[PDB]
Design a protein around this motif. Structure first.
Motif, PDB file in Angstrom:
ATOM      1  N   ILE A   1       3.511   0.933  12.311  1.00  0.00           N
ATOM      2  CA  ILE A   1       4.446   0.637  13.148  1.00  0.00           C
ATOM      3  C   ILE A   1       5.816   0.496  12.693  1.00  0.00           C
ATOM      4  O   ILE A   1       5.650  -0.328  11.635  1.00  0.00           O
ATOM      5  N   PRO A   2       6.998   1.079  13.007  1.00  0.00           N
ATOM      6  CA  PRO A   2       8.021   0.803  12.239  1.00  0.00           C
ATOM      7  C   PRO A   2       8.732  -0.562  12.334  1.00  0.00           C
ATOM      8  O   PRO A   2       8.425  -1.366  13.203  1.00  0.00           O
ATOM      9  N   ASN A   3       9.285  -1.077  11.063  1.00  0.00           N
ATOM     10  CA  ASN A   3      10.166  -2.097  10.897  1.00  0.00           C
ATOM     11  C   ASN A   3      11.164  -2.068  12.116  1.00  0.00           C
ATOM     12  O   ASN A   3      11.536  -0.984  12.217  1.00  0.00           O
TER      13      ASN A   3
HETATM   14  C1  LIG Z   1       8.418  -2.801   6.249  1.00  0.00           C
HETATM   15  O1  LIG Z   1       8.574  -3.702   5.334  1.00  0.00           O
HETATM   16  C2  LIG Z   1       8.884  -3.394   4.122  1.00  0.00           C
HETATM   17  C3  LIG Z   1      10.435  -3.098   3.832  1.00  0.00           C
HETATM   18  O2  LIG Z   1      10.799  -3.763   2.790  1.00  0.00           O
HETATM   19  C4  LIG Z   1       7.684  -2.273   3.371  1.00  0.00           C
HETATM   20  O3  LIG Z   1       6.926  -2.961   2.827  1.00  0.00           O
HETATM   21  C5  LIG Z   1       7.001  -2.882   1.548  1.00  0.00           C
HETATM   22  O4  LIG Z   1       8.363  -3.083   0.821  1.00  0.00           O
HETATM   23  C6  LIG Z   1       8.193  -3.241  -0.547  1.00  0.00           C
HETATM   24  C7  LIG Z   1       9.290  -3.917  -0.784  1.00  0.00           C
HETATM   25  O5  LIG Z   1       9.297  -5.203  -1.198  1.00  0.00           O
HETATM   26  C8  LIG Z   1       8.039  -1.643  -1.140  1.00  0.00           C
HETATM   27  O6  LIG Z   1       7.813  -2.071  -2.536  1.00  0.00           O
HETATM   28  C9  LIG Z   1       6.647  -0.893  -0.414  1.00  0.00           C
HETATM   29  O7  LIG Z   1       7.259   0.279  -0.252  1.00  0.00           O
HETATM   30  C10 LIG Z   1       6.327  -1.435   1.185  1.00  0.00           C
HETATM   31  N1  LIG Z   1       5.217  -1.252   1.325  1.00  0.00           N
HETATM   32  C11 LIG Z   1       4.761  -0.297   2.078  1.00  0.00           C
HETATM   33  C12 LIG Z   1       2.990  -0.335   2.250  1.00  0.00           C
HETATM   34  O8  LIG Z   1       5.211   0.510   2.654  1.00  0.00           O
HETATM   35  C13 LIG Z   1       6.957  -1.676   4.577  1.00  0.00           C
HETATM   36  O9  LIG Z   1       6.686  -0.316   4.204  1.00  0.00           O
HETATM   37  C14 LIG Z   1       8.169  -1.210   5.746  1.00  0.00           C
HETATM   38  N2  LIG Z   1       7.645  -0.476   6.685  1.00  0.00           N
HETATM   39  C15 LIG Z   1       8.114   0.474   7.181  1.00  0.00           C
HETATM   40  C16 LIG Z   1       9.497   0.968   6.918  1.00  0.00           C
HETATM   41  O10 LIG Z   1       7.593   1.203   8.268  1.00  0.00           O
END
Ligand SMILES: *[C@@H]1O[C@H](CO)[C@@H](O[C@@H]2O[C@H](CO)[C@@H](O)[C@H](O)[C@H]2NC(C)=O)[C@H](O)[C@H]1NC(C)=O
Ligand SMILES: *[C@@H]1O[C@H](CO)[C@@H](O[C@@H]2O[C@H](CO)[C@@H](O[C@@H]3O[C@H](CO)[C@@H](O)[C@H](O[C@H]4O[C@H](CO)[C@@H](O)[C@H](O)[C@@H]4O)[C@@H]3O)[C@H](O)[C@H]2NC(C)=O)[C@H](O)[C@H]1NC(C)=O
Ligand SMILES: *[C@@H]1O[C@H](CO)[C@@H](O[C@@H]2O[C@H](CO)[C@@H](O)[C@H](O)[C@H]2NC(C)=O)[C@H](O)[C@H]1NC(C)=O
Ligand SMILES: *[C@@H]1O[C@H](CO)[C@@H](O[C@@H]2O[C@H](CO)[C@@H](O)[C@H](O)[C@H]2NC(C)=O)[C@H](O)[C@H]1NC(C)=O
Ligand SMILES: *[C@@H]1O[C@H](CO)[C@@H](O[C@@H]2O[C@H](CO)[C@@H](O)[C@H](O)[C@H]2NC(C)=O)[C@H](O)[C@H]1NC(C)=O
Ligand SMILES: *[C@@H]1O[C@H](CO)[C@@H](O[C@@H]2O[C@H](CO)[C@@H](O)[C@H](O)[C@H]2NC(C)=O)[C@H](O)[C@H]1NC(C)=O
Ligand SMILES: *[C@@H]1O[C@H](CO)[C@@H](O[C@@H]2O[C@H](CO)[C@@H](O)[C@H](O)[C@H]2NC(C)=O)[C@H](O)[C@H]1NC(C)=O
Ligand SMILES: *[C@@H]1O[C@H](CO)[C@@H](O)[C@H](O)[C@H]1NC(C)=O
Ligand SMILES: *[C@@H]1O[C@H](CO)[C@@H](O)[C@H](O)[C@H]1NC(C)=O
Ligand SMILES: *[C@@H]1O[C@H](CO)[C@@H](O)[C@H](O)[C@H]1NC(C)=O
Lengths: 7, 727, 726, 7
Positions: C108-110
């Motif tokens: 699910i999107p942020n």
């Molecule tokens: C929503 O939250 C974060 C965006 O910062 C994402 O979670 C991780 O974020 C870290 C940064 O600290 C990255 O290293 C990783 O790429 C992210 N992990 C994953 C599993 O994606 C998260 O992905 C975001 N979700 C979205 C954009 O859908």
């Protein structure tokens, strides 16, 4: 920086 | 001998201080606005001819609030529809009036919403800037030849100044300089493309349903500054179907090496110009004296005609390098620089030689060169009696540096200790404006006989009404601190009894190169709090104050809000030993830098203070413009002086604010010290548990100077003090 | 010891509650020390649903949870970012309780603006960057529905500022269908809507201040345009178009400007829409039946119901919601009597006339549940107090067989009652809000038992015996021949022989209720307990739940009657033997703020000081949905005169004879800072002395923990000073 | 108009 010192 | 100087007497100015303003159209005649008309006064005998009659003002807008006579005295200008921009900037409509024909110019008027205009120094040419672009009107009944075409709102400025130059670099709106005979038209161009934008809301009238948001290219500290370009247009090749011919004089490579500022322009001769550049740190300025090459139309510089001025202890000059005064020929100039002992004196520079020879020396500082001629040089300094708070006129002989006289010291050496002058075009006459410490005395004098000639304004009017009213008494003295003597003043109450304990007020400015202790006559707000409220309002010029030596002034470099704040806490502490001071009733109040110090004083854990109004304070130096803050504090980078940028914030002193009371006054439309600074002060105060008081002044600038708000700010401030003094 | 301001600011005397979650008609969900428990109402057994300490790897921590109706998956809302009154963005995950894991494929999107399950199943439907999606399966991708989303321009499925506040009253413009076939949505267009532009300063780490922009429509300006769609979520494949039909409002409302009120789902082949006019004195309900042959949501003149009001506007704020049966051929709605008394009216879906099942000298507050046999509603008929609320039960076969299922359970402790009937109205949960310590009781519709009462605020009662607490007196004063209601937090050990100070806590907004019977540990409880100040409240002309004649009295003249009868009410209180005629104040917020500032400018002399927080200054400064409902249009044709004849800046020279606090937050999305700062500008232009206080980037509530403490501490100082109290 | 966050 000061007002326009009109005192 | 029973009425007092009530607050209403200040807010309504029921005690007028008349002046006498005059402008020299020649070397022995001047103009003056006598009872609504303009008289062509003469300086030799005093006989006054009518220049322009009154009631001549009609059908020219609602009013006429400025006038400018063409130097040939053939024409004159009417400035109406005034519209304040910032400090010196303003828009207005202008009209030209035939003096011989006694008519009005109808063909080719001056466009509505003009930004600036000026005649040529000779003749009646006309350069002006409209919508950020220069125009020239060689004759008034003719059309103009547009010069610049790049002017864009809040981007390109051609012939005027963006906010930061008008404020901290130029202290005027105009970026135009006609050459002596009017051949060339020097000017500057400013490109605020990458300058970030302060954004504040503005509410306008009760009528308006959606507040304007004002956007200003305001370069805050350590952010991208604008760019400067200087040009010299040749107004001889200005035809309709011919190109705008121009050259770009540039800073030498020492300043060009990085960011820079154009901080001054001086025309020397019709074929020689003097430009003054300075680096962004401002501890390095240079001058590039430039000669016009007739074959190529260049303005060629040379290493020999380049003079450097640096400061290993702070900034160069006071708020900018002092401007140079060239001889009538141009092979030398007299400029005010600092010596080896740290005292700003006049040095004589051969135009084509490096070293300079000092022509004034002492434990005093030279205020400014007022006029220069082949035999004599006229300057102003606080040497007389050795007190830095005074100003007197001096005349030094060029060939004989020994023979130096004072034109103003022992004239009325009790009524007259603060003097300012404006000479004739050839220094054949001078008006000696006497500002204090008594009632002001505008006295015209002759260069040759040094006589009273005629008294222009004696303010006998003020004397009459002011001897039936009890008035206070300034006490300028000194206290010893850090093995040096720093000045102080106390506007004592009438009928002063040295036994009754009295409540204290500390009016503070305490800025770099500041002067709170002066021999100037000022019917002030304190003049009420002393005459009608029996409060001693003091003032102290500690470390940071100017005109007292670079060693004192350049003590706050890369540490603003430190020495000046502690020096004002020590100085109040020494006032709470004198038996006439209720130390349990000491106050502090400040505007702009005062508001900063006041707040930093209240948040220092002093114990000396109990209440404190802060009007329009700076809360964090990164929140203020770049020129000012980098002249002293440096750069907010972690490799310059960020550590001190982070501990000079008032928000870092919030916990120590619950020991005192505090009144945060600020204007919602402050283009200088924005609402941001007071607002983030509130946030950390609120976030810490500090109880304080506030008052926003809607649509008011850094002066809160509209009539009903100027009354209110001092009506709301008196109550705070009174209830804090249990008065 | 008294009830100190610290006791109020830090809420040391907690008021416990009981929140439910009805999944079936005999099962609900609860939370216990961060543990999700499933309760079986029929008996008393309780099976767990998710244990504490299960919360981990969820950003920071969980601030909501949404078990899908099928109880297969569950949502974990975290990363909460408030926007306006109900608007918030978040980041969500999904937890398969069966698989006992977390879905990591097709996440699910942020910054999700809104999400909701399907009424049955796990058909997830969310909105992101103004655009709708449908994730029918947690481990599957998102089928995008709208592609026209644009910030501050096009809003698909969520609401803009003026809908979210003064019309829909939530961020949600998404309405699924009973069985999960149709996803109806709405499209808003604030394109030509004017934008208000206030500044925001945020943390210290911002060299330059941001400037917020909100599509805010003020009175007389251009409003957002709505379009109502319905999506057949059956024809939803990646390589297929999205099917949808726009039901435009009936032509009796589409003629000009209009609003969309509510979207009620009757049957799976019957959607029920409520469209109102810009004047909000002409409302119509369009019931649209599907047609498998055409695939169109067609409507007819038989399924159209009009509801207007010559006495004023329609309903209380937004008009009344239609309550449809299961057969769908007849609905029940709260419309107003000919005498001007709103009660439940039985409407036939194809018959224009109506038949009232209740009527009297009271008013039905709202319908709560409808069963094939009964009909449950809450009302102020109990003891004839409009300030009371109790649950009833009328019978469809006999409109004279109504029974009060809450009136006399504890008629001393419980005069304010809320409800939560089960899915099939088998079990209801009652909420005793006052005047006693809040009591949360579980009930059965059949045997009428108290089964398992959850909360009794035993913690509150124990602590409050070791403290001195004020008394609440409710009584009636007679103005203009009718009997209005007033209330007083009389201080502890009240003695009429001593002359007391007054605080006229004021709201008196359209359809208001300050005179209620609720237990509220407020600021007044401090002012009465410690500082011994009588805090009164009055509900005169303009209030609701009392009669449309009273409510629609202030119609098209705000700032007049509500203000005036506040002056007479305090004067009548001042003719009482315990009111310092020299020590009386008036303090307000929102409409209480506007009134307080009009009261103080009335030259009455009754009031000495006066605090105002986020006050309306001129009415041309507020959103048109609200202001035009009562005041009309700020044009010379409609009501320009009464718009200017009511600005607070008209009543300024009289401010010279009183003290006045003007509190406001800088980042006000609602009652903008504009109003406070322009009232100030007129006050300064007159010579009136007054104190003020801005609150940095505080909203309309001034509700950050350290700013809330500041505003009641700063107001307390202004109040005690003006009352010369130590 | 419109009250603070409920009460
Ligand atoms: C929503 O939250 C974060 C965006 O910062 C994402 O979670 C991780 O974020 C870290 C940064 O600290 C990255 O290293 C990783 O790429 C992210 N992990 C994953 C599993 O994606 C998260 O992905 C975001 N979700 C979205 C954009 O859908
Ligand atoms: C930001 O940070 C800097 C770095 O710490 C800080 O500068 C330091 O300030 C303190 C306080 O002023 C200085 O310590 C004092 O310095 C003064 C003169 O500068 C001296 O008078 C003090 O010595 C004694 O003086 C009297 C004896 O005759 C005693 O009566 C008195 O109580 C003192 O005991 C003392 O040395 C310190 O030297 C500076 N450091 C530097 C490197 O300059 C600055 O103050 C901070 N700014 C803010 C706004 O907080
Ligand atoms: C004004 O300054 C800018 C940079 O400070 C100059 O450079 C242009 O900047 C814009 C936007 O920052 C870019 O889109 C352009 O491409 C830049 N120019 C080039 C040649 O790349 C700009 O040219 C300056 N303009 C004037 C009239 O001095
Ligand atoms: C002119 O000013 C600059 C900047 O203020 C000085 O350079 C900095 O000096 C401070 C203090 O000595 C150092 O901490 C920084 O690391 C310096 N930064 C850079 C980029 O040089 C410079 O020293 C001054 N010039 C003279 C001649 O004193
Ligand atoms: C229409 O067909 C499929 C979906 O039915 C689309 O995507 C393909 O899906 C298969 C298996 O579902 C994948 O293995 C392919 O990689 C996908 N193809 C592509 C090109 O992405 C397909 O894209 C759709 N057709 C078009 C033209 O978009
Ligand atoms: C419903 O509201 C409308 C709009 O407020 C009413 O029509 C207005 O009535 C006022 C009365 O002074 C006139 O000044 C306006 O010109 C009217 N507007 C229009 C567009 O005609 C209407 O009368 C109300 N209906 C009822 C039944 O009260
Ligand atoms: C708006 O103006 C009207 C009429 O000028 C005011 O209404 C009158 O108010 C007085 C006393 O305030 C009453 O005696 C009249 O009976 C009222 N007339 C009507 C037609 O209602 C009204 O007070 C003004 N609104 C203000 C001042 O807020
Ligand atoms: C100028 O002053 C007033 C009008 O402004 C009036 O006495 C007359 O027009 C003039 N007075 C002179 C010239 O003395
Ligand atoms: C200048 O050039 C323009 C170009 O179109 C021409 O029209 C004009 O006549 C020229 N000026 C004169 C004085 O001929
Ligand atoms: C509204 O959105 C539509 C598309 O949905 C677009 O055509 C139109 O320009 C937008 N603006 C207005 C004011 O309708």
């Amino acid at each position: 920086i000061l007002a326009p010192p009109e005192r | 001998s029973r009425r007092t100087y009530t607050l209403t007497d200040y807010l309504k100015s029921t005690f007028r201080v008349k002046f006498y303003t005059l402008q020299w159209i020649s070397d022995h005649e001047y103009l003056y606005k006598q009872e609504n008309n303009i008289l062509l006064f003469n300086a030799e005998y005093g006989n006054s001819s009518i220049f322009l009659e009154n009631s001549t003002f009609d059908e020219l807008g609602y009013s006429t609030n400025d006038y400018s006579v063409s130097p040939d005295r053939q024409f004159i200008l009417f400035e109406y529809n005034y519209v304040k921009q910032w400090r010196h900037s303003y828009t207005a409509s202008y009209d030209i009036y035939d003096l011989n024909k006694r008519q009005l110019i109808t063909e080719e008027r001056i466009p509505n919403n003009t930004q600036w205009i000026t005649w040529s120094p000779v003749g009646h040419k006309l350069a002006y800037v409209w919508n950020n672009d220069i125009y020239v009107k060689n004759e008034p009944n003719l059309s103009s030849q547009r010069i610049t075409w790049t002017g864009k709102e809040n981007v390109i400025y051609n012939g005027v100044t963006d906010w930061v130059y008008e404020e901290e670099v130029f202290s005027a709106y105009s970026a135009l300089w006609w050459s002596p005979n009017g051949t060339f038209l020097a000017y500057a161009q400013f490109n605020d493309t990458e300058v970030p934008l302060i954004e504040y809301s503005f509410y306008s009238d009760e009528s308006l349903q959606y507040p304007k948001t004002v956007r200003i290219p305001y370069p805050k500290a350590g952010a991208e500054n604008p760019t400067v370009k200087f040009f010299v247009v040749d107004t001889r090749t200005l035809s309709p179907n011919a190109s705008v011919t121009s050259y770009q004089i540039v800073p030498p490579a020492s300043v060009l090496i990085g960011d820079h500022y154009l901080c001054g322009v001086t025309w020397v001769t019709e074929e020689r110009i003097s430009l003054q550049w300075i680096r962004r740190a401002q501890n390095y300025s240079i001058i590039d004296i430039c000669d016009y090459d007739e074959s190529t139309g260049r303005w060629i510089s040379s290493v020999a005609r380049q003079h450097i001025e640096i400061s290993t202890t702070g900034w160069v000059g006071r708020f900018r390098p002092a401007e140079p005064h060239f001889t009538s020929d141009g092979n030398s100039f007299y400029k005010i620089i600092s010596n080896e002992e740290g005292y700003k004196h006049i040095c004589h520079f051969q135009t084509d030689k490096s070293n300079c020879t000092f022509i004034t020396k002492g434990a005093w500082e030279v205020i400014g060169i007022e006029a220069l001629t082949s035999d004599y040089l006229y300057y102003i300094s606080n040497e007389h009696k050795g007190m830095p708070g005074g100003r007197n006129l001096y005349r030094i002989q060029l060939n004989d540096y020994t023979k130096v006289t004072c034109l103003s010291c022992e004239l009325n050496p009790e009524r007259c200790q603060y003097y300012s002058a404006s000479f004739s075009n050839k220094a054949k006459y001078y008006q000696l404006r006497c500002f204090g410490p008594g009632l002001p005395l505008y006295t015209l004098h002759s260069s040759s006989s040094d006589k009273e000639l005629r008294v222009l304004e004696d303010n006998s009017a003020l004397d009459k009404m002011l001897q039936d009213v009890q008035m206070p008494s300034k006490k300028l003295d000194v206290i010893n601190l850090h093995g040096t003597k720093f000045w102080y003043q106390m506007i004592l109450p009438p009928h002063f009894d040295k036994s009754k304990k009295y409540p204290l007020l500390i009016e503070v400015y305490a800025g770099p190169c500041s002067q709170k202790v002066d021999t100037v006559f000022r019917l002030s707000w304190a003049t009420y709090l002393a005459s009608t409220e029996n409060i001693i309002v003091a003032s102290f010029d500690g470390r940071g104050s100017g005109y007292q030596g670079d060693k004192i002034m350049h003590a706050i470099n890369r540490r603003l809000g430190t020495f000046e704040v502690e020096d004002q806490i020590e100085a109040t502490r020494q006032f709470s030993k004198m038996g006439f001071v209720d130390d349990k009733r000491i106050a502090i109040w400040g505007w702009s830098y005062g508001g900063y110090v006041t707040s930093m004083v209240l948040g220092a854990g002093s114990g000396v203070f109990k209440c404190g109004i802060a009007v329009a304070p700076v809360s964090k130096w990164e929140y203020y413009d770049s020129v000012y803050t980098e002249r002293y504090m440096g750069l907010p980078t972690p490799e310059d002086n960020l550590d001190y940028y982070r501990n000079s914030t008032v928000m870092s002193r919030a916990e120590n604010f619950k020991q005192v009371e505090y009144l945060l006054i600020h204007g919602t439309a402050d283009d200088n010290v924005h609402f941001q600074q007071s607002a983030q002060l509130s946030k950390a105060l609120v976030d810490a548990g500090v109880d304080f008081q506030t008052m926003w002044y809607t649509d008011e600038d850094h002066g809160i100077a509209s009539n009903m708000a100027h009354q209110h700010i001092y009506t709301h401030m008196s109550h705070f003090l009174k209830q804090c003094f249990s008065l």
